[PDB]
Amino acid sequence: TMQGFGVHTSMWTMNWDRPGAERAVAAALKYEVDFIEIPMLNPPAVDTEHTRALLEKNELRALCSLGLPERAWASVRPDAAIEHLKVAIDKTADLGGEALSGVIYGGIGERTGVPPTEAEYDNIARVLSAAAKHAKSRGIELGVEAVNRYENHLINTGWQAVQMIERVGADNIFVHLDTYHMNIEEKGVGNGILDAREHLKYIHLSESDRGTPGYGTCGWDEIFSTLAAIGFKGGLAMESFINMPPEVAYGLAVWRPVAKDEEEVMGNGLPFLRNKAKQYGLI
Amino acid sequence: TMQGFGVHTSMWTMNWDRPGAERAVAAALKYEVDFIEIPMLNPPAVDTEHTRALLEKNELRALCSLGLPERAWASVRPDAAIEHLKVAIDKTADLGGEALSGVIYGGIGERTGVPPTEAEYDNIARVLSAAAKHAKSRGIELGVEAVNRYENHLINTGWQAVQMIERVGADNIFVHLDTYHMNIEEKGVGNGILDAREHLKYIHLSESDRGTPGYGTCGWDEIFSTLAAIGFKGGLAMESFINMPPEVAYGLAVWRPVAKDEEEVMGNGLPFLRNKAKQYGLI
Amino acid sequence: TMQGFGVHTSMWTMNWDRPGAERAVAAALKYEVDFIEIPMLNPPAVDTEHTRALLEKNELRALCSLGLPERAWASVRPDAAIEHLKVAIDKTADLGGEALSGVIYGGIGERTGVPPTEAEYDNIARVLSAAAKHAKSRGIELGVEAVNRYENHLINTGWQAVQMIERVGADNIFVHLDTYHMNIEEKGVGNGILDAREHLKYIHLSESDRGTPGYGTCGWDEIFSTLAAIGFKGGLAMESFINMPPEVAYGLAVWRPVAKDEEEVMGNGLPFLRNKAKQYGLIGN
Amino acid sequence: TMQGFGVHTSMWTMNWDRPGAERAVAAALKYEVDFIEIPMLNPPAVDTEHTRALLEKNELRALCSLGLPERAWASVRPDAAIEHLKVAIDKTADLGGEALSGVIYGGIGERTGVPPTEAEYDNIARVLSAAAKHAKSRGIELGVEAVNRYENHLINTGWQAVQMIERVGADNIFVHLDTYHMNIEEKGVGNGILDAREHLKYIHLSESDRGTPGYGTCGWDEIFSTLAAIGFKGGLAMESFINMPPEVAYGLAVWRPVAKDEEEVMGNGLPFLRNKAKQYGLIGN
Ligand SMILES: O=C(CO)[C@@H](O)[C@H](O)[C@H](O)CO
Ligand SMILES: O=C(CO)[C@@H](O)[C@H](O)[C@H](O)CO
Ligand SMILES: [Mg+2]
Ligand SMILES: [Mg+2]
Ligand SMILES: [Mg+2]
Ligand SMILES: [Mg+2]
């Protein structure tokens, strides 16, 4: 159950191969973070032994995240989804990760053009119920990330995520919020935190344009005050799309640079967020 | 246990004589509030039975507030402070009030030019302990309002108010915050609410210039989100200095109109605050 | 050029057919707005005489907006775009509208999957240059609306929109910003207004979730102070998708109600916005 | 005249004695600011030639500010006030300072208990007109700082400061705003900047509790967007009362530490403010 400050390793690696894992872990140490979030674009290819050894040796905690590929979108292909999640759960457990989070209930790019249906939600609950069983067997939790309306039409708000967790009735699925998505979806950004308060264990601290935290439109004081007020003790994960590989960036609608360089994003954004977390007593 | 929305009657009445009480109660009904806060500038002159019958007839709840006059400033004249507060506490209870709140520990205009001393605080604590016993005997609570540095040098922040409540050791003293004061004093406005969370039962929703809520510098989204997040269930009291009698106005450094007219303040401010309360789930 | 307060008619009707025009115009008058913004999504279907009669009878001004259908996306099918824009311009002018604005350079839901290219912009400029000549012939101006990265890949910021206006070199194209889009795209919302100031004549005061203004994440105090500071004097227009025009639903991505109903958005959002304009002393208030 | 970033020297010393100036100038160069604001609260104690030598060898600009002592409040004792200002003006000029700003029209802590009267403003205008001519004699400008209702009852807003400037009619008096004070007095912080835009040459970027900028309640994005929008090009100065000059402690009301220490305020506040000025494209950053 993640605690403290971490970073999504997108800024150094989206391909978690051997040199990529090395590079990301090194950056994590340079910035003195408490954990890393490992994107698993291709869970089969991950060398669990190498990553486990790296995390243990540097006393770094980790969790993993993914989005389901189209061949495995839970809403329409629930059997493939369960298969894909079971592989990723095993990989996360093996490398020492404490959770698999993200868009584990569908894909980036899902859109029917109409509101989400009970049939879609039924398939998703089937998938999550099975994956949660499997995750319990490996000693990890699952995280359901609310993302904005353009990426997925099924779970966009903290309240929708909580409704899905109530539908599944498991005890090892938590809510994962992202300030970039909440900046679009939440009716006042604090309401996403309020609505998920009983299940919120992880939040991406990401600026409104995916650039440098502190230098966009996210309401950071409301965000941090509300996290402190609900007693949030989970993971604070800085995320920025700076230096993302072009192929991955284009898929997430990055048509232009989100910030100047890593020096700008990490050198201004990370102190901003740590200072805010101290200011409001999260630490 | 004050609940819901109310108004400080200074917008219609600072002199709580018979016609003043009638006028304020009439306004309260028009704006459909749940309670009124009655300023008690001259507690001996209050007709308790008239006001009690007005409140019971109109299903309206009430609390009273005051600041201590200089002859009874608790920090330096605690015996006179106790005598003054007993009179106000009895009048408050006799009229049907549920609490006496405000600057019950000192006065507007206290300033030594140096930090508050332990001797000052010892005198305040003795006064408030005697007052709390007297209040307990009449079935009411006391509220300690944090006010800004220019009005009083002793209790300016939520954390300072809680400290005094802990020094006193009574269980019937609560913290009373005011967004106008917090806008100056709190290191991020939500931190006053967070620091006071265990004892917070009343908040003045006042704009940064004492004018129209919604049209100043107060961070309303952070305020309401943090209230909701700490589970606040006490009194939400609108306060504006519009139409205050000039003698009282000048005493609080109102050197110019805070707003056009009551129509602006109540017509724009009260909907703004009620809409925010609904937005963040306080209602 | 538009002044005062207005409303995008999705507040009141899905389509600009005859009963939709009757309903929207009646609602607009109830709220004492100065103008309405009418979607030009099915030009051959618009009964221009019926709408112009309604507008002139009730002393309501209007402009139109659209997104281009994929058959006529300017970036890839510029000749189809020109023809489509000429029809939309003529219908806009025939009903008495004073400008045609919005995503007039592409689709709502347009994306190639890669960043925008010079070849795409070269085509858009050709299209807008031809369209702006046609608009001038009918006495109306054109507006280019910056929309967020998920709705179009070509013009997302005030500075991009201004670069397109500079690339075209016309005298009758303005910039149209939208607080909902700037909430995503601008590095500090005021920056979109600053970057666009020389050409900004129309702004959608749309809440961050397309809901009720004042009850989302938009930085309204920053928005209004910056509009006042640059001396904005064009149209202030609400946009809340209480009703969703079918031809743009897929791209606008409203999958759940933006608010309880039109009464809530108009009854709470419009007074908030009018009160903010007065607070910051906006020209015309 | 003043450009770029600067710091009120209460950041580093309580008094402007010889050792205090050693320290402040040293710090100012550690943080690579462009200027310092020196309190002229104790003129007979200021070694002007020593400070002036430090400023030139360290390539550092300066201005001074003050509040008037009660014996010389321009409101009630105008002839005293003129004499006090001429001395403060002369010593400011002697040490290399380019303006004398602040509460030059009254006391920090001045109040009558009643709203300001026309007689009071008459006296202030007479004082400032006299003072302004003496200031021109020495080649420096005067600044009128709006402060909050609890520190002075006469000039609390941008608009009031402009009205006093327009009354005096002098070419060499600017408006000085302070975000700490505007946080209380302005009905929307950007309105103070808007109202003062024709005369605004200096702003204190001071947090709402006089602590670390970025970590209080000031609406920084609105502040910086509005400064960019009006084309602000004057001094951007920090003010945090780590140290408190004794002459003004009673009126400034710092009864507890504003922040952990100077390292926290400068180490977190200055990068925040520099980053914001760049974010909004402020002239010179
Ligand atoms: O804000 C937008 C695009 O997201 C709309 O203004 C669009 O141009 C309009 O709906 C067409 O009528
Ligand atoms: O902001 C203020 C007044 O509160 C100060 O700038 C004051 O004028 C200065 O301390 C005098 O040097
Ligand atoms: Mg995320
Ligand atoms: Mg109060
Ligand atoms: Mg729009
Ligand atoms: Mg100042």
CA dihedral (B32, B37, B38, B41) positive or negative: negative
Contact indicator for B100, B89 with CB cutoff of 8 Å:
yes
Q: Among this protein's residues, is B239 annotated catalytic?
A: yes
Measured between beta carbons, the chain D residues lying within 8 angstroms of A216 are none
Solved using: X-ray
Cα D95 to Cα D86: distance, rounded to the nearest angstrom: 14
Q: Is D279 on the interface with A (CB under 8 A)?
A: yes
- The pair phi, psi for residue A199, each rounded to 5°, is -130, 0
How large is the C-alpha radius of gyration of chain C?
17
The secondary structure of residue C7, as a DSSP letter, is E
Point out the catalytic residue in the list D37, D145, D185, D207: D145
Token match 């925008």: residue? C116
Identify the burial level of C66 via C-beta atoms within 10 angstroms of its C-beta, where 0-12 means exposed, 13-18 middle and 19 or more buried: buried
Residue of B nearest to D259 (CA): B187
Q: Which uninterrupted H or E stretch holds D142? A: strand D141-145
Contact indicator for C105, C74 with CB cutoff of 8 Å:
yes
Alpha-carbon separation of residue B13 from B1, B9, B180, C18 (angstroms): 24, 6, 21, 55
The secondary structure of residue C29, as a DSSP letter, is H
**Chain A nearest C-alpha distance from C109 (Å):** 10
Alpha helix stretches (DSSP H) within chain D: 18-30, 48-57, 78-94, 118-137, 158-168, 179-185, 190-195, 220-229, 249-252, 262-264, 270-279
Identify the burial level of B22 via C-beta atoms within 10 angstroms of its C-beta, where 0-12 means exposed, 13-18 middle and 19 or more buried: middle
CB proximity list for B14: less than 8 A, separation 6 or greater: B20, B39, B41, B244, B245, B248
Q: Is D67 in the pocket of ligand 2 (CB under 6 A)?
A: yes
Structure tokens at B244: 């205050």
Judged by CB atoms closer than 8 Å, whether chains meet at C215 and A189 is answered as no
Contact indicator for D224, D192 with CB cutoff of 8 Å:
no
Is residue B255 helix, strand or coil? Answer: coil
Structure tokens at D61: 């600009």
Q: Is C96 in the pocket of ligand 1 (CB under 6 A)?
A: no
Is residue D11 helix, strand or coil? Answer: helix
The count of C-alpha atoms lying within 13 angstroms of the C-alpha of A217, restricted to the half-sphere facing its C-beta, is 33
Q: Is D145 in the pocket of ligand 2 (CB under 6 A)?
A: yes
Q: Which uninterrupted H or E stretch holds B251? A: helix B246-251
Q: Whose CA is nearest to atom 8 of ligand 2?
A: D102
What angle, rounded to 10 degrees, do the helices at A18-30 and A48-57 form? 20
Contact indicator for B207, B218 with CB cutoff of 8 Å:
yes
Q: Which uninterrupted H or E stretch holds B57? A: helix B48-57
| DSSP of C78-107 | HHHHHHHHHHHHHHHHHTT-SEEEEETTS-
Contact indicator for D44, D13 with CB cutoff of 8 Å:
no
Cα B127 to Cα B155: distance, rounded to the nearest angstrom: 15
- The pair phi, psi for residue A167, each rounded to 5°, is -60, -40
Q: Which of A189, A193, A279 has its CB closest to that of B188?
A: A279
Contact indicator for D238, D206 with CB cutoff of 8 Å:
yes
Contact indicator for D244, D235 with CB cutoff of 8 Å:
no
Helices (H) and strands (E) in chain C, counts: 11, 8
Neighbours, chain B (3 or more CB pairs < 8 A): A, C, D
Cα C186 to Cα B259: distance, rounded to the nearest angstrom: 33
3-state secondary structure chain A: CCCEEEEEHHHCCCCCCHHHHHHHHHHHHHCCCCEEEEECCCHHHCCHHHHHHHHHHCCCEEEEEEECCHHHCCCCCHHHHHHHHHHHHHHHHHCCCCEEEEECCCCCCCCCCCCCCHHHHHHHHHHHHHHHHHHHHHCCEEEEECCCCCCCCCCCCHHHHHHHHHHHCCCCEEEEEEHHHHHHHCCCCHHHHHHCCCCEEEEEECCCCCCCCCCCCCCHHHHHHHHHHCCCCCEEEECCCCCCCHHHHHHCCCCCCCCCCHHHHHHHHHHHHHHHHHHCCCC
Ligand 1 atom closest to the Cα of residue C101 is: 8
Identify the burial level of C285 via C-beta atoms within 10 angstroms of its C-beta, where 0-12 means exposed, 13-18 middle and 19 or more buried: exposed
CB proximity list for A114: less than 8 A, separation 6 or greater: C255
* Cα B160 → chain centroid: 16
> Strands C61-67 and C99-103: what pairing?
parallel
- What's the CA-to-centroid distance between C274 and ligand 1, angstroms? 22
The pick from C2, C37, C65, C153 for probing ligand 1's pocket by mutation, whose C-beta has the most ligand atoms within 8 angstroms, reads C65
Contact indicator for A98, A1 with CB cutoff of 8 Å:
yes
Cα A239 to Cα A75: distance, rounded to the nearest angstrom: 27
Return the amino acid letter for D278: K
Judged by CB atoms closer than 8 Å, whether chains meet at D150 and B189 is answered as no
CB proximity list for D225: less than 8 A, separation 6 or greater: C188, C189, C190, C191, C193, C194, C222, C225, C226, C229, D190, D280
Q: Is D216 on the interface with B (CB under 8 A)?
A: yes
Q: Is D103 in the pocket of ligand 2 (CB under 6 A)?
A: yes
Measured between beta carbons, the chain D residues lying within 8 angstroms of C224 are 188, 190
E-assigned strands of chain C? 4-8, 35-39, 61-67, 99-103, 141-145, 173-178, 200-205, 235-238
The count of C-alpha atoms lying within 13 angstroms of the C-alpha of A251, restricted to the half-sphere facing its C-beta, is 14
* Cα C17 → chain centroid: 19
What angle, rounded to 10 degrees, do the helices at D220-229 and D270-279 form? 50
Structure tokens at A242: 């700076």
**Chain B nearest C-alpha distance from D49 (Å):** 33
Token match 């998703």: residue? A124
> Strands D141-145 and A173-178: what pairing?
unpaired
Q: Among this protein's residues, is B145 annotated catalytic?
A: yes
Judged by CB atoms closer than 8 Å, whether chains meet at A225 and B281 is answered as no
**Chain B nearest C-alpha distance from C268 (Å):** 8
Identify the burial level of D30 via C-beta atoms within 10 angstroms of its C-beta, where 0-12 means exposed, 13-18 middle and 19 or more buried: exposed
Ligand 1 atom closest to the Cα of residue C66 is: 11
Alpha-carbon separation of residue D59 from B73, D52, D94 (angstroms): 53, 10, 17
Contact indicator for C69, C29 with CB cutoff of 8 Å:
no
Please choose, from the candidates B184, B120, B124, the residue with its C-alpha nearest in 3D space to the C-alpha of residue B158: B184
Beta partners for C175?
Answer: C144, C200
- The pair phi, psi for residue A278, each rounded to 5°, is -65, -45
Q: Is C103 in the pocket of ligand 1 (CB under 6 A)?
A: yes
Cα D112 to Cα D152: distance, rounded to the nearest angstrom: 9
Cα B275 to Cα D163: distance, rounded to the nearest angstrom: 37
Cα C22 to Cα D243: distance, rounded to the nearest angstrom: 68
Token match 């947090």: residue? D207
Cα D141 to Cα C212: distance, rounded to the nearest angstrom: 48
> Strands B4-8 and B35-39: what pairing?
parallel
Q: Is C145 in the pocket of ligand 1 (CB under 6 A)?
A: yes
Cα C193 to Cα D221: distance, rounded to the nearest angstrom: 13
Alpha helix stretches (DSSP H) within C58-178: 78-94, 118-138, 158-168
**Chain C nearest C-alpha distance from D222 (Å):** 4
Beta partners for A63?
Answer: A37
Is residue B198 helix, strand or coil? Answer: coil
Cα A92 to Cα A73: distance, rounded to the nearest angstrom: 20
- The pair phi, psi for residue C235, each rounded to 5°, is -90, 140
Residues with C-beta atoms within 5 A of ion ligand 6: D 178, 204, 239
Alpha helix stretches (DSSP H) within B95-156: 118-138
Is residue B263 helix, strand or coil? Answer: helix
Cα D11 to Cα D242: distance, rounded to the nearest angstrom: 5
Beta partners for B253?
Answer: none
Neighbours, chain C (3 or more CB pairs < 8 A): A, B, D
